[PDB]
């Protein structure tokens, strides 16, 4: 198109990490600055 | 793991103890074990495959006898370990005898 | 039997023998020796925690002092657990999760 | 030892080959018997230390010499472990740097001291506990993790303990593994244990360093990725007077 490439907001390899871990149990949960769960999925 | 993360929070002497409690025979006397064995019940500790049989379902060891041979023990008799039940079989356990299916009335 | 009379002296399952006209009580107690991973699972599910934090913060002031490093290596795990929030029952799964298809295509 | 083996020997911070003897205390010298077995005494009124030397020992102090605590006595390498606990962590730091540069220098390289300085700082990054505040008294903890629990449990909410510690000479690789960050600790050989230990405890990361962030493919926390810069925004003059015409309606 001629657009300034992407800005890949959340890297796949992050999502793939979270999950491979879950498939083993182990909660693994994300947190922002002030410290409240943030969520990286939603797809 | 390297130290045994579950097998710490319940003692369970490292593993072997913790390892036997599914496969390798052996049962753990979970709660309120109220029995005897060599001493009283060992509560938060293991017990053999035979040990559980002797403790709840009861030890009922059959003492089968060859045809034609007369036994030793009377009807109502407390027979001890090391005491001969018959001229064919002995008593492995300390218990009372009885006539299961006779041959001569 | 016989109303408020003949009393049983032992812990045991019972047999009634109408031919022998005797009651017998078999020496076997009502222990709850469950087995498998539910046993261990149960064992952790019935475990007061801050009480075990006392059992070991009181294992620092009056010990025999021979292998004190053994009770210490137990504390690490206990406090680690206690402050985290992790019900140490979740070390035995009820539901095993399944990884999506095309994360292992 | 010299060359590249020696550079490792220093960073890894190990009891070196040729463990040259160093006086535990300061006093006077008293070498005795050059035949059967050879020994150097360090002594004052009060203390009197006896150091037994291999014979093949290339000691370079003549008799009745005066001497300083922690000063080499037999020539060769200093066991930087023996140095730490006998002259200081600061004093150890300055030894290491000075000694590595020694190799690089004598082979022919020039590179800044401040470079080596940074790594040596990490070799000291850790401390062991004496008399704790809210943990067990055997733990190995990061020096400025137990700094908020030292002069802050005394700066406002005073009480319990400032927590007493002792310095520890971790050898670069061993100072590598012992990191707050489960993420990076994982990459290493034993991955189960990290993930075991770490999950049992609440363990949050914080993603302080680099390796960690890379592992998850996040945007490196340095340079264009440093909080200090990354948030900078840019606006035009005509665009800025499109905010003067729209922020008071």
From Swiss-Prot, chain A:
Signal peptide start and end residues: none
Subunit-structure text: The RNAP catalytic core consists of 2 alpha, 1 beta, 1 beta' and 1 omega subunit. When a sigma factor is associated with the core the holoenzyme is formed, which can initiate transcription.
Biological role: DNA-dependent RNA polymerase catalyzes the transcription of DNA into RNA using the four ribonucleoside triphosphates as substrates.
Family designation: Belongs to the RNA polymerase beta chain family.
The protein, known as: DNA-directed RNA polymerase subunit beta
From Swiss-Prot, chain D:
Domain of life: Bacteria
Span of the signal peptide: none
Assembly: The RNAP catalytic core consists of 2 alpha, 1 beta, 1 beta' and 1 omega subunit. When a sigma factor is associated with the core the holoenzyme is formed, which can initiate transcription.
Job of this protein: DNA-dependent RNA polymerase catalyzes the transcription of DNA into RNA using the four ribonucleoside triphosphates as substrates.
Family, per entry: Belongs to the RNA polymerase beta' chain family.
Protein name: DNA-directed RNA polymerase subunit beta'
Record organism: Thermus aquaticus
Lineage of the species this protein comes from: Bacteria, Thermotogati, Deinococcota, Deinococci, Thermales
First and last residues shown, out of full length: 1253 to 1501 of 1524
